[PDB]
Design a protein around this ligand. Structure first.
Ligand SMILES: COc1c(C#N)cccc1CC(=O)N1CCC[C@H](C(N)=O)C1
Ligand SMILES: [Zn+2]
Length: 139
């Protein structure tokens, strides 16, 4: 679990969105596993605007942060799950690191701010949905 709070927006994994998220929907994309909803309280996370390939992510299954090198956002095949059929997920970045299903929502940050959130994993890999291209999160 986990979310990003920036201005009047809440960014979460689309497969973990709640009834309130869907009732206050701003935008969602199944191909990215992202959903953004509106909030009444003000958010203070800084979204990174960069091409960093190194950062730190929070891993709930270990109660620890880990430093990682990660790939550029791209289309990566993702095996079928209870939430989606087998498909290419876009804007996804991989890194060698530990992750378990409950780790989705953990934030990945670089020196510039929030880069994305955990969205996939397994086999000693962790995948992050990128948010750095969503320029509207800040305006
Ligand atoms: C495969 O299970 C893991 C593991 C592992 N091992 C480690 C981390 C996460 C998962 C779960 C995961 O990747 N899923 C299920 C929920 C939706 C995801 C998606 N974006 O399509 C795919
Ligand atoms: Zn950066």
């Amino acid at each position: 679990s986990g979310a990003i709070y920036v201005g009047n927006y809440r960014v979460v994994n689309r497969h973990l969105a709640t009834h309130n998220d869907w009732a206050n929907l701003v935008w969602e994309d199944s191909s990215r596993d992202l959903l953004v909803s509106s909030t009444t309280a003000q958010g203070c996370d800084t979204i990174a605007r960069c091409d960093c390939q190194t950062g730190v992510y929070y891993c709930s299954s270990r109660r620890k942060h880990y430093p990682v090198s990660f790939s550029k956002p791209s289309l990566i095949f993702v095996e079928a799950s209870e939430y989606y059929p087998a498909r290419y997920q876009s804007h996804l970045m991989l890194a060698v690191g530990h992750s378990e299903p409950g780790d989705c929502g953990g934030i990945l940050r670089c020196q510039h701010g929030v880069v994305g959130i955990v969205s996939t994993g397994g086999n000693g890999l962790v995948g992050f949905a990128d948010v750095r291209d969503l320029l509207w999160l800040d305006e």
